[PDB]
A paper describes a structure:
Here, we present the structural and functional elucidation of CPR-C4, a hypothetical protein from the genome of a thermophilic Candidate Phyla Radiation organism, identified through metagenomic sequencing. The function of CPR-C4 as a cysteine protease was predicted through remote structural similarity to the Homo sapiens vasohibins and subsequently confirmed experimentally with fluorescence-based activity assays. Furthermore, detailed structural and sequence alignment analysis enabled identification of a noncanonical cysteine-histidine-leucine(carbonyl) catalytic triad. In all crystal forms, the structure of CPR-C4 is a homodimer displaying a mixed αβ fold, with a central curved antiparallel β-sheet surrounded by short α-helices connected by flexible loops.
To assess the effect of the non-native His6-tag, crystallization was also subsequently conducted using protein without the tag, resulting in a third crystal form in space group P212121 and improved resolution (2.25 Å), with one dimer per asymmetric unit. Surprisingly, the two Zn2+ ions were only present in crystal form 1 and were both found to interact with the same chain (chain A), in a tetrahedral geometry, as is most common for Zn2+ coordination. However, the absence of other metal cations in the zinc-free crystal structures implies this is not a promiscuous site, and the tetrahedral ligand arrangement is strongly preferable for Zn2+ binding over other transition metal cations or the sodium and potassium present in the buffers used.
Author numbering:
A (entry chain BBB): -5 to 38, 44 to 216
B (entry chain AAA): -5 to 39, 45 to 215
The structure:
Amino acid sequence: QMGRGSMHYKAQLQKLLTTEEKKILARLSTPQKIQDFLDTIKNKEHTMWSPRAVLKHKHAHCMEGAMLAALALAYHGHSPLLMDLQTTDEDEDHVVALFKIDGHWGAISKTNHPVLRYRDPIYKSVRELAMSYFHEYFIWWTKKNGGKKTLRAYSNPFDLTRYKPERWVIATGDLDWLAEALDDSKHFPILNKKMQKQLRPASRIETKAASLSEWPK
Amino acid sequence: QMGRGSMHYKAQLQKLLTTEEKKILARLSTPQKIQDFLDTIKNKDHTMWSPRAVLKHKHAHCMEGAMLAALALAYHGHSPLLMDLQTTDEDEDHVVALFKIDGHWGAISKTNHPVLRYRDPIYKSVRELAMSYFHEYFIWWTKKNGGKKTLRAYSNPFDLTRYKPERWVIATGDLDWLAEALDDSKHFPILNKKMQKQLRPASRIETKAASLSEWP
């Protein structure tokens, strides 16, 4: 199956996890199965729960969802990769878990709205995948700059392998240092100042569509 | 500063158009102003009207919208470019009008739903722009293959300059031959058979959101 580094990394994860947690991760053996699992978790004070906490309470915001996805991907031999989607100060950033199948990038995403969703493994580069989010990242919750497109940059794939898995997989603290390290990593701008002046606000039908909610119900 | 070919093409268009038609096209001097204008046209639920018919009756499906956009782009010196988005037989193709500003591709689009919309001129290649549509091209109107992602290929930019402008700008016929020529042009596949087997259906929240209607 997987390489030496991956099998070693999986072994370190198995030392930290309970039999129940491993039985769950063993079932999530494709990126599609992982997204299906996050679909059963209730979408979200302030928190930054570990994958352990998320599996216990079955509640997650986008980075909590992406860290659990990255864990499940690593348990089946993928790199635990996050990508930050970074907006203007008018909006909140969004995090996904990147994956590759046959040389093509996909993304697992935990969101409550019909935008910034899952991406199939069909995108030839990180850039191409990231640009598939741009048009649907906009102000939908106020008339003030209604429809303004707010995405400005995407991170390099952020490999959680650089940290001891104890520090995030089963942490009882808040992992704000991990969020901060992601936000501080290499990002690539999507626009220059000229391109920003060209931007057209999303239509009323688009802001109405974006406002629909998965949770509750 | 507009080129010789473009000025000549614009001259041919001016011979064919009424003063009212030219007054409209003169106003639509940016891609954004064109999309704003298509927003005031009623979306349709077979026809294949000319830009003349669309300006007269203020009604358009996607290719009628894109042909009017391409005309308005050409009236200000852009190439009148169409891109075909080609689906499985479970769905209908969608056509946009391509444009470039400072080396980056955008797209003008006439649709009734909050998917397959306008694209800002920020995309580094036709491929990159086309791939920005893939995830939001799915079956939302039936439970039969509910949520199936149906996009399979995108055309090369289709330059309408190859035809005598009389043939489409002011045609009174149906332009089924023009639709057929677009569908027959070079297309680039997005998937192979392996990748198609990977595809995941769109969620219920996505199919509900896609179902929303601008018109009536």
